[PDB]
């Protein structure tokens, strides 16, 4: 029960996450959505993507010393959206200029020479629909590539190729 | 006009479904939703579930000669809703006194003992939530067991026990 | 077999009821009978009543989104009985407790400061008699006021005084 | 600042309510509010309204055999809100469909041809402002009239005209 019509998101308690310790709230409603890629290993089953989720967070919490996984939501090629910082805890995904104003969703994999399956792309768009529904994202929300906001290779040629197809993508 | 937000469903093309030969339409909106199980093998990978989808559909087409798989939607333990007949077409699943007035979603597997994993229950609760959003189901919608409308074990002793706690389950 | 001899009811067809989508049945013999009133306007002709019967049902199915009018029978000042859900389908007129165990007859008017015409009382008293003969009501059924089971003013002050007089009434 | 800063609710002890027998729980934040009316006599002193609260309660507890007064809150024309079963206990006020997902507030009296005093209306909204401040009511909550969800004249033509004016009033 994470309020009406939210396209099946895996809760932290399910992917065996560690307790978040982030105190910063995000000023709703949010205008931007930054799509990125973990550039880490990819997964196609929920079982493997639960393990892969943990991997991203432990690296952010134990090693990098941040309060929680830097992303608001992680997407698996298993076609499921994983909950990280969520719609309210401000993310750590695109630097100081963008972190307090945009939501950050990342695709679990390295998408330079590899494309994400339709189910994952479907789940991401479906996640943004629930966003508007909850009142976290503005009906008029703008989707920006990670390259668009920071000098980075992410989300990867192939995935950056497809998010331009997305209707809400702004130049 | 009125779809607030829906949910992610695997299209027929993706699980490689045969062409539907059905033409009878369900009068819109629908008031009843019948939950049942396929009493067959379960799956937890998006790959194997797309395959399990074909099996149920082929047994219904090539062996029982029905115009398409009997259920409107299929639910996998991979946490994904698979498209069957959909929101618009009538689908043989619980008797002629009930097939013209109800949507039929079916969990893929036999849940006499075994319970469906949380993500499967989330997939179905979200599906129904999308139904209301699309206006395919009315906000009054009543969830019913397959055993509540014809003599069968169908929902599965333990899955029947679970759907009884759902907000919309009427006597 | 000993022709029950009590049918003097206007059928759904005759007063032009919209189709019922209700399918949950009562178990006969039925023990209780709950008398309520519409608190709407009253009718005294078979013509004006066929209109009122339609209105109550409309307010029930179109505004509240109910499967059909909530009462089992409606009594009019025309001296005739109107079929609602009938002797078999479970009504919606007294809550989760009584609805499964009683028939809900309702006088079509506001009897807070009025008395229903003799012919209307006769049709009511008669209806119940029909009940026993068909076997839908127990030979020793219990009549009850609507306010006896719900916090309401039904069946109206003066009419409530009338039923406490009846022989099958029970505190 | 921003603490609870809630209104002033007369607690049960102060109006000497009988002990609550209820155990069912509402799951906050609540989305709906159903405005009703006791349909009885009104009051304009903290002394007479405390009296009224008891009649309504006793009738609901010993006549109908309920676990506590049906409403969550009772508004008085004295300008004071009288605590019913509160913000956390499921109340009986609008059928098995709404009771679990809504809070029940009742204006003490009958308002068919009588408008409640400004006081009452302010106390009623103060309670709603309070509700959201405590996380009891969902911020984008909705207000419906009693007649909007059940066959009844309640809350009374005039009070109904008043609540249809409110923001949060929907369909
Ligand atoms: C021209 C240049 O210097 N490019 C830099 C990138 O090589 C460098 O690596 C990218 O960093 C991402 C975030 O740390 C990695 O996830 C990603 O795998 C990596 N890109 C690739 C595909 O090699 C980024 C660091 O962000 O900075 C660029 O400036
Ligand atoms: C090789 C294999 O795993 N076969 C699976 C079947 O055993 C399994 O059962 C069949 O399912 C139908 C639809 O649910 C049933 O109606 C049918 O009785 C049953 N087949 C029989 C005769 O046992 C199906 C599930 O569809 O999947 C196959 O993959």
CA distance D96 to chain B (A): 10
**Residue B55 Cβ contacting ligand 2 at under 6 Å:** yes
Residue C97's closest chain B neighbor by CA?
Answer: B171
3-state percent helix, strand, coil for chain B, nearest multiple of 5: 25, 20, 55
Beta bridge partners of D17: none
Beta bridge partners of A90: none
Q: By the 8 A CB rule, do B87 and B47 touch?
A: no
The preferred substitution site among B55, B93, B152 for testing ligand 2, maximizing ligand atoms within 8 Å of CB, is B55
SS3 C58: helix
List phi, psi (to 5°) of A120.
-75, -40
**Cβ–Cβ of B167/D97 closer than 8 Å?**
no
Report how this structure was experimentally obtained.
X-ray
Cα D36 versus chain centre, distance = 7
Distances (CA, A) of A167 to A38, A144, A158, B143, C111: 23, 11, 17, 36, 61
Distance CA C67, CA B138 (A): 11
Distance CA B130, CA D97 (A): 19
Report DSSP state, residue A41. Answer: -
Nearest one of B67, B87, B81, B97 to B27, comparing CA atoms = B87
Q: By the 8 A CB rule, do B143 and B168 touch?
A: yes
Query: Residue A73 is inside which H or E element, if any?
Result: strand A73-75
**Cβ–Cβ of A130/B5 closer than 8 Å?**
yes
Segment D158-166 long-range contacts (CB within 8 Å, at least 24 positions apart):
D158/D111, D158/D112, D158/D113, D158/D114, D158/D115, D159/D35, D159/D37, D159/D107, D159/D111, D159/D115, D159/D116, D160/D35, D162/D115, D162/D116, D162/D121, D163/D35, D166/D125
| Strand-strand pairing, D81-83 and D73-75 | antiparallel
Taking CA atoms only, the protein residue closest to ligand 2 atom 24 is B40
Nearest one of A72, A131, A80 to A106, comparing CA atoms = A72
Cis peptide before A29 (omega within 30 of 0): yes
Q: By the 8 A CB rule, do C68 and C23 touch?
A: no
Residue D100: its chain B contacts at CB < 8 A?
167
**Residue B59 Cβ contacting ligand 2 at under 6 Å:** yes
The single residue listed with the structure tokens 């009683």 is C102
Distance CA C63, CA C73 (A): 20
Q: How many residues does chain D have?
A: 171
Report DSSP state, residue A99. Answer: T
Cis peptide before B29 (omega within 30 of 0): yes
User: How are strands ordered across the β-sheet holding B102-107?
Assistant: B9-10, B81-83, B73-75, B102-107, B30-37, B137-145
Burial class (CB in 10 A: 0-12, 13-18, 19+), A18: middle
**Cβ–Cβ of B31/C24 closer than 8 Å?**
no
User: How are strands ordered across the β-sheet holding D9-10?
Assistant: D9-10, D81-83, D73-75, D102-107, D30-37, D137-145
Which segments of C89-166 does DSSP mark as H helices, in order? 118-134, 157-163
Taking CA atoms only, the protein residue closest to ligand 2 atom 4 is B41
CA distance C68 to chain B (A): 12
List phi, psi (to 5°) of B126.
-75, -35
Q: Which atom of ligand 2 is nearest to the CA of B56?
A: 26
Distance CA A165, CA B151 (A): 50
Q: Residue B75, by phi and psi: left (phi above 0), alpha (psi -120 to 50) or beta?
A: beta
**Residue A39 Cβ contacting ligand 1 at under 6 Å:** yes
Distance CA C7, CA C24 (A): 23
Cα dihedral sign for D149, D152, D157, D159? negative
Nearest one of A140, A133, A142, A75 to A109, comparing CA atoms = A75
Other C-beta atoms lying within 10 Å of the C-beta of residue B153: 15
Q: How close are the terminal C-alpha atoms of chain B, in Å? A: 33
| Strand-strand pairing, C102-107 and C73-75 | parallel
User: Tokens standing for A50?
Assistant: 């639960």
Q: By the 8 A CB rule, do C141 and C33 touch?
A: yes
Distance CA A59, CA A68 (A): 10
Residue D145: its chain C contacts at CB < 8 A?
none
Q: By the 8 A CB rule, do D80 and D74 touch?
A: no
Q: By the 8 A CB rule, do B112 and B36 touch?
A: no
The single residue listed with the structure tokens 């155990």 is D23
Cα C15 versus chain centre, distance = 15
**Residue A152 Cβ contacting ligand 1 at under 6 Å:** yes
**Exposed e or buried b for every residue in D31-54, given b needs 16+ CB within 10 A?**
ebbbbbbbbeebbeebebbbebbb
Distance CA C22, CA C44 (A): 29
**Residue B40 Cβ contacting ligand 2 at under 6 Å:** yes
Report DSSP state, residue B169. Answer: B
Burial class (CB in 10 A: 0-12, 13-18, 19+), B19: exposed
Other C-beta atoms lying within 10 Å of the C-beta of residue C62: 10
**Residue A151 Cβ contacting ligand 1 at under 6 Å:** yes
Q: By the 8 A CB rule, do D70 and D104 touch?
A: yes
Distance CA B89, CA B104 (A): 11
Cα dihedral sign for A130, A133, A137, A139? positive
User: Tokens standing for C68?
Assistant: 């059909």
Q: Who contacts B15 (Cβ-Cβ below 8 Å, separation ≥6)?
A: B49, B50, B51, B53, B54, B82, B83
What domains can you pick out in chain D, each with its CATH number? 1-171 (3.40.80.10)
CA distance B30 to chain C (A): 10
Q: By the 8 A CB rule, do D35 and D159 touch?
A: yes
Largest CA distance in chain A: 38
Q: By the 8 A CB rule, do A140 and A25 touch?
A: no
DSSP chain D: --S-----EEPTGGGTPPPP----B--SSEEEEEEEE--S----SHHHHHHHHHHHHHIIIIIS--SS-S-SEEE-TTS-EEESSTTTB---SSHHHHGGGEEEEEESS--SS-PPPHHHHHHHHHHHHHHHHTTSEEEEEEEEEGGGTSSS-TT-HHHHHHHTTSTTB--
- Mutation target to probe the D interface, by most D beta carbons within 10 A, among A1, A2, A3, A28 is A3
**Cβ–Cβ of B7/A10 closer than 8 Å?**
no
CA distance A158 to chain D (A): 40
Cis peptide before D29 (omega within 30 of 0): yes
Distance CA D27, CA D41 (A): 33
SS3 B138: strand
User: How are strands ordered across the β-sheet holding C30-37?
Assistant: C9-10, C81-83, C73-75, C102-107, C30-37, C137-145
Beta bridge partners of C106: C36, C74
Resolution of this model in Å is 3.2
Radius of gyration of chain D (CA): 15
On the CB side of B153, CA atoms within 13 Å amount to 10
Q: By the 8 A CB rule, do A117 and A158 touch?
A: no
Report DSSP state, residue B69. Answer: -
Nearest one of C3, C160, C9 to C71, comparing CA atoms = C9
B–D: how many Cβ contacts below 8 A? 3
The single residue listed with the structure tokens 């209105």 is C55
**Cβ–Cβ of B5/A133 closer than 8 Å?**
yes
């Amino acid at each position: 029960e994470d309020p009406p019509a939210c396209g099946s998101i895996v809760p932290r308690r399910e992917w065996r996450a560690l307790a978040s310790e982030c105190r910063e709230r995000l000023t709703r409603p949010v205008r931007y959505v930054v799509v990125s890629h973990t550039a880490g290993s990819h997964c196609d089953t929920p079982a493997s993507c639960a393990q892969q989720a943990q991997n991203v967070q432990s690296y952010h919490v134990r090693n990098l010393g941040w309060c929680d996984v830097g992303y608001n939501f992680l997407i698996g090629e298993d076609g499921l959206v994983y909950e990280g910082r969520g719609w309210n805890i401000k993310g750590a995904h695109a630097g100081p200029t963008w972190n307090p104003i945009s939501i950050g969703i990342s695709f679990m994999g390295n998408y330079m020479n590899r494309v994400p399956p339709p189910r994952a792309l479907r789940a991401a768009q479906n996640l943004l629909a629930c966003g508007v529904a909850l009142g976290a994202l503005r009906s008029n929300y703008e989707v920006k590539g990670h390259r668009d906001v920071q000098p980075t290779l992410s989300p990867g040629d192939r995935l950056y190729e497809i998010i331009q197809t997305w209707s809400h993508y702004r130049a």
